[PDB]
Amino acid sequence: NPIDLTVLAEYHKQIESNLQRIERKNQRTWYSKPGERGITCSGRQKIKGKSIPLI
Amino acid sequence: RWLELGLTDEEKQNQLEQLAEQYDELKHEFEKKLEAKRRKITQGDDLAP
Amino acid sequence: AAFRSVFPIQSYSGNSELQYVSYRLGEPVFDVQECQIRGVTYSAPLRVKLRLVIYEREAPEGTVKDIKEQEVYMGEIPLMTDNGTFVINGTERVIVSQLH
């Protein structure tokens, strides 16, 4: 009877597999490719300036 | 009920009854127009990556 | 004229050849005002009926054995508004004539 952390490896593999499934689904439906027509909108984001003192 | 008001069959009223079901299928065509509009409006967009 | 200047196109005597039947412009998927709202061009899709042929060997004037006809999609050509302008990225742009 030596020491044992097989349940630790199973738990860590379960965490890795569940996180890989969720992140694969999110990176599947957020960086998809639009088809035959192109990007149907535009980003249009612009940043203006401010008056920032320097004390 | 004016359309289904019974009267002796002339050829003109029967052809105009056929034209009455032709506006019925035109009404079906307006229904498909409404469906064509709502599938455009309801559906989400594509965007930039 | 642009399709008669290039086609037919053929290999280095391999007797495979691509020739030209006709063309067609598809309908605009988006009309003008909401296209100006959303962001795209006022495009129109293009269809080209191409007829891929391959000959039978040892007879260059021999009858082709495989013809294959398709409506290949290529590109998007922008149409013109009723006021002479074009729509590019939500906005409205004009092409100036050139004196050369």
Curated annotation (Swiss-Prot), chain A:
Residues 33-55 are annotated as: Disordered. One of its GO terms (biological process) is DNA-templated transcription termination. GO terms for molecular function: bacterial-type RNA polymerase core enzyme binding; DNA binding; RNA binding; RNA polymerase binding; RNA stem-loop binding; single-stranded RNA binding; transcription antitermination factor activity, RNA binding. Coiled coil: none annotated. It comes from the Viruses. Keywords: DNA-binding, Transcription, Transcription regulation, Transcription termination. The keyword RNA-binding does not apply. Plays a role as a transcriptional antitermination factor that allows the virus to initiate its lytic phase. Activates expression of the delayed viral early genes by modifying host RNA polymerase (RNAP) into a form that is resistant to termination signals. This antitermination function requires the host NusA protein which serves to stabilize the interaction between antitermination protein N and host RNA polymerase. Interacts with host nusA. This is Antitermination protein N. The gene is N.
From Swiss-Prot, chain B:
The modification N6-acetyllysine is found at K27. It comes from the Bacteria. The RNAP catalytic core consists of 2 alpha, 1 beta, 1 beta' and 1 omega subunit. When a sigma factor is associated with the core the holoenzyme is formed, which can initiate transcription. DNA-dependent RNA polymerase catalyzes the transcription of DNA into RNA using the four ribonucleoside triphosphates as substrates. Belongs to the RNA polymerase beta chain family. This is DNA-directed RNA polymerase subunit beta. The lineage of its organism: Bacteria, Pseudomonadati, Pseudomonadota, Gammaproteobacteria, Enterobacterales. The chain holds residues 996 to 1044 of 1342 of the full protein.
